[model samples]
Target: MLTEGISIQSYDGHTFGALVGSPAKAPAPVIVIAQEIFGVNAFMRETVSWLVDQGYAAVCPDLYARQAPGTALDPQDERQREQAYKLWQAFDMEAGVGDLEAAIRYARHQPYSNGKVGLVGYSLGGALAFLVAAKGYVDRAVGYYGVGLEKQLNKVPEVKHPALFHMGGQDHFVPAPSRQLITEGFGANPLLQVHWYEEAGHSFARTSSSGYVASAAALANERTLDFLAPLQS
Candidate 1:
């Protein structure tokens, strides 16, 4: 079973909003779910639910809570979508890192978590996961088509925990060039593993999207769970 609710607390005296899911036990490994440019919408919620089904106590903190609690893009409105994307790009990356760190702390102290934790993110959230991993904050991390990898390739070298990055072969948003750059830069890193789906596109793992590819998403999720399971042991 999963229980969902809000967490209100001041990190450094600044209030933030967090959505948490508790599995019925203490000291379970936590998985932090990050959102895309669309914010913590249905796709993210479903991902959190999937994590819960995998025996993880998952939490999704609203990194954009400072901007809007439940802000999301309306696909029908191209202008709104563009505006939302702009907001996401304008978000303070460092602040996002801090928010995720705070989430780790919260999970560590939660009744249903063991303090051992992992991170999984989509798009913008995927980038945030990479950042947090580079900072040595989580036990493991899985990034689904993180577009921010190009600018932060150097930091990838600092990642100590095991990580898996999933990308779409035909993803124009995060083209082959950026993917190649990251792969080449992190080739020597033993803890990093990268997978590319030839038929999937950006947000292919998102069930709500028209581009959702069940087979690819399932395989990627399975691999992610495999990587995370050992961390709890």
Candidate 2:
């Protein structure tokens, strides 16, 4: 009786708010999608569906569910950015990581799950992916334009899993110096791959974002899938 597209799922004893895109078969790998500071809005849902279409069970758990309870906003809404920033400022990173891990566990045990989980995150979620990977909570990780990672640079040494990092050269949120520090902090680990899109900006992969660049998103996704191909097997 499970329907498609967006749906709800739980993590541990906590209630989970998420956008789910289910695959057509059993025992498929699940891709845990982390949201932007804007929460899991329409654009995120579109990306989730795209992941499902790629033959993976895509789940975007609501990191803000317990904090704000159903905190989704429209990109065009004027006051939404302010509200999103307020929530972002108040977000408890550790609890958020726990929430994501709970979702990962659920995915590992799902009937449609093949017991592997890859994390894919955008913006703030992207940064979360890096943190979680460093903490060893996933099969692999892909982060796009994650902000403020320079401050957390020390954690880079803890990441033992494969990591795919993306950066937009013109990103205001993550400037060139910070991006360089992030890369350098990784210590040139061969397991870590970095992608740079000089012409794009933050949130370039989100179609509804003002910084969206079709070509960059396409190339990033292509490389991402190529990196994730092993998980599907």
Candidate 3:
């Protein structure tokens, strides 16, 4: 998996940084990598790399650029983890969606794209992915243990695109009540697919997560690839 960093302009005219996977002269479908509270740290970058390995043009834009450009923090460090929380608190969800929408436009406009774009987001990113899909921007979306998603479930009916959601049984953020909400809210939508990892927790598939489970990660990745397979040109 390889990547290149470039600058892109947002709808509000802000210049932001993005990591592009597999630079190409030919068209390829794009997948947007939304950031977690850690920003576009190593895990996010690797996720971008993962998409490229599947023969895609992936992009991870810096959603925190307006407030604190280059806000990457190591998840293992206590101080850094605290800062990650601070960053999350300072984040404006509306503005973040605007930034992601701009990133989507950038992906669609790329010379190496076939004008199709998908999304895969984890943690805080997972929640935003839901919003973006509800807004009817991306062709499809996948979210992994999205935090703060239940609050916006009211928009579920607005989502017209195919979507995949992954949840961990032991995840602290998504408890029984939230799970019930999700099931009740999206269960009837044929275009929506939901998978539950009975023994896994938050970030179960992320190598950097304390709860990382290799088996769960592999399984989730396989399913994710399957979801993207038919969409890519």
Clashes of each: 3, 0, 0
- For model 3, what is the C-alpha lDDT against the true structure? 0.84
Residue-level lDDT tens digits of model 3 in 1-233: 11345778877788888877854436788999998888788998788777877788888888888888877788999999998998899888888888899989889888788888899888888888888988988998988888867788788888899988888989988899988888888876777788889899998978878999888889888998899877667
- Weakest 10 consecutive residues of candidate 1 by summed lDDT: 1-10
Query: What lDDT score belongs to each candidate, Candidate 1 first?
Result: 0.79, 0.82, 0.84
Best by lDDT: 3
**How many residue pairs clash in model 3?**
0
User: Which residue ranges in model 3 land beyond 4 Å of their true spot?
Assistant: 1-5, 23-25
Candidate of highest TM-score: 3
Instruction: Give all TM-scores, in the order shown.
Output: 0.90, 0.92, 0.94
Sort all candidates by lDDT, best to worst: 3, 2, 1
Native-referenced Cα lDDT, model 1: 0.79
Q: Which wins on lDDT, candidate 2 or candidate 3?
A: 3
Positional deviation of residue 46's Cα in model 1 after best superposition, in angstroms: 0.8
Q: Rank by TM-score, descending?
A: 3, 2, 1
- For all the candidates, what are their Cα RMSDs to the real structure? 2.6, 2.7, 2.0
Q: Which residue window of length 10 is worst by lDDT in model 2?
A: 1-10
Residue 215 in candidate 3, Cα distance off native in Å: 1.6
